[PDB]
Design a protein around this nucleic acid. Sequence first.
RNA 1: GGCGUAAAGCGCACGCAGGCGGUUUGUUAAGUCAGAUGUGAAAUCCCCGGGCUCAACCUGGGAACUGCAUCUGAUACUGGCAAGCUUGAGUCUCGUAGAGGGGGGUAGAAUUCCAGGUGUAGCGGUGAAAUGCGUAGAGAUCUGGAGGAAUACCGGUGGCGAAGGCGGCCCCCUGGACGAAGACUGACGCUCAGGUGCGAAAGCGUGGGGAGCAAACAGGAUUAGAUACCCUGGUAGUCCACGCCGUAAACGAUGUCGACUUGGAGGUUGUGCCGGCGUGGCUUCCGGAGCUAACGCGUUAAGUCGACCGCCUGGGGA
Lengths: 129, 88, 224
Amino acid sequence: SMQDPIADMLTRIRNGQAANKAAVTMPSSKLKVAIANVLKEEGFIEDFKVEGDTKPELELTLKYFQGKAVVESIQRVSRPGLRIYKRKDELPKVMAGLGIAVVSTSKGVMTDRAARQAGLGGEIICYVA
Amino acid sequence: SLSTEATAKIVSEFGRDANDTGSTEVQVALLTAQINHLQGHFAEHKKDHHSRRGLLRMVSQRRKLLDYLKRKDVARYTQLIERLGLRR
Amino acid sequence: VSMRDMLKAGVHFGHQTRYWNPKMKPFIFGARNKVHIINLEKTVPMFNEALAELNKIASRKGKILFVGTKRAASEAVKDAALSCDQFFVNHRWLGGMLTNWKTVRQSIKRLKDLETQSQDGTFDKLTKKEALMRTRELEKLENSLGGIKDMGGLPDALFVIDADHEHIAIKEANNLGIPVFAIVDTNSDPDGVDFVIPGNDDAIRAVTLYLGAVAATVREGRSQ
RNA sequence: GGCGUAAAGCGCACGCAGGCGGUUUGUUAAGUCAGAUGUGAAAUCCCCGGGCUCAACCUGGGAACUGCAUCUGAUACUGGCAAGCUUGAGUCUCGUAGAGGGGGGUAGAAUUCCAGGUGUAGCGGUGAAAUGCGUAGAGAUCUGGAGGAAUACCGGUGGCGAAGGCGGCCCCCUGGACGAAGACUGACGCUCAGGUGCGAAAGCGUGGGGAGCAAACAGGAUUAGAUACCCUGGUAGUCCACGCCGUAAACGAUGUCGACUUGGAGGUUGUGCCGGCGUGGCUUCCGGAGCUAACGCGUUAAGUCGACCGCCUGGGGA
């Protein structure tokens, strides 16, 4: 059954980028909206939006710069089968700094950069590059 | 299978309107009625394995529904298994 | 060129829905009698910008190669390039004409000496039999290289007919970074062409339409 | 790190423990995170210096000791709690297709046998023969009867079933799947060690049955030999009821479930609209990206992910 909606969303993003899809439409969740916020505020995707009252649908508009997909490697890190937590001292760096590690911290879902600046640890949601 | 009249009778006797079929009480009543009927079929047909698998499916579905009710509301669970004579 | 002439000459008339390529869904509006109709609003601007690039490359004295081999347009293409001051290849393509120019150059050198042997009286000092083989070499090499005898260097751009039929030439030209232009049906592929121009090339009317329009724009570019 | 073919998906299923868990709100603060306090002996290791002529070595200070407990905070995520929601899952109505299962009955074709009629020197078999059957009348042909087993055509890389498997026709009892409109519950889910059940053929036990076929066995050939291949016979067994066995190259050599990702040529069954325009499921074949060692797989994945389980770790021994 469906048990990892976050990894499902990352997979839909990755498959759309490999299929050169313009946009992907999926059931919407508040954590999905938060990761879409983090991805939009870092330029990995164009924009997002949500439609639906009882059953909100999350539609992400993908972006491609020189024909090729913007997101190169997007990967689920902390999974239901194995949850991953890092203290601020030991937060990861994706692509030696060029990418992001989406880190849910106590002050919201933010990147590894914002978490490190804010002096916080948290759960390591996904790597993006 | 249970005749249409029997299904309607059980739904009315266990649903909180003439059109309440999906509730846990109605479902468990229907499963119990079908099992009570099928015991007579399988008394004559101890070799009817292909139908016994479906009977055991009904058994397992009923067990899961009773467990769900028990964690959901103990009062309705006791009332339900009292109304039927279900062991647990 | 404009939408009305394209619809008149059956530019929109593509191939069957069973022969449609997976990559040409945007270039088509819908279906009728199981024949796909190439979008005619998406055709005019793309065709015109390809024409404009051809015109610009005609300012730099840039060479253009016209490619189309099927019998329906052989004379049509061979004239559409003859009256353009540009080289062509209209018969059975020898694979490696571009990537292996260092051997077919010797081939065309032999052809040139054999065709100056045509107007030399050479086919009179031999015993009426070697002349047969020399004339057959003339015939076969003229068929194989009917427009690029005076080519004198790899062509600068590749204007092609039925991109799928000439995928060898297309991939050869891609292998050296040469701009490539394709008159490409719905049943063909845009991956090897940097300028994709959806349009029928089996309808001889459509072939003549594209060839005449591109000839007009290239002659205009070469005027200045 | 792997499990189509190199070693590796249990034959299949159900299911307890366990592992994991769609969406919204409030609350809690356990996991998680921040800071502090205490402790984490010294030494060692590392860093910055000092002393032996240097170095080893000794030595000052720090860092480190990645841990544990307490305290105060933060609430994004997981967990607990409480209430919701319907899209996962499930129940109801009508309808569809099916060799799905159990039991009972019946029908025609064919074989064998028994009886009879007609009829006479062959029949049968083989590469060639012989064994064998036939003058006590065979084979052939016609008629009557007995019996057992299997169900021609339909018939379809069709269908149904978890797998094993299921094929004339009729009836009774009975499981599942799917579809169009709705109505109802409201996460009730997925997977599953242990466990339980089912599970080809052969085989075993008890009692029946026995046409054909045929292990064993016998004879005739073949052959250097022929405990075979071929021929002539032929008993278990194949059939039935009950119980057992529990294994197959039980194979897609491909675990289940869910989500996502170009196309095309065929077949199949529902439902909407006027033979065409759609809408759900299934099935065969090629093939793109991608993947693979390659072969190949390719929306029915062997592609991209997630949950859980099973399994592998050179060949032989085994």
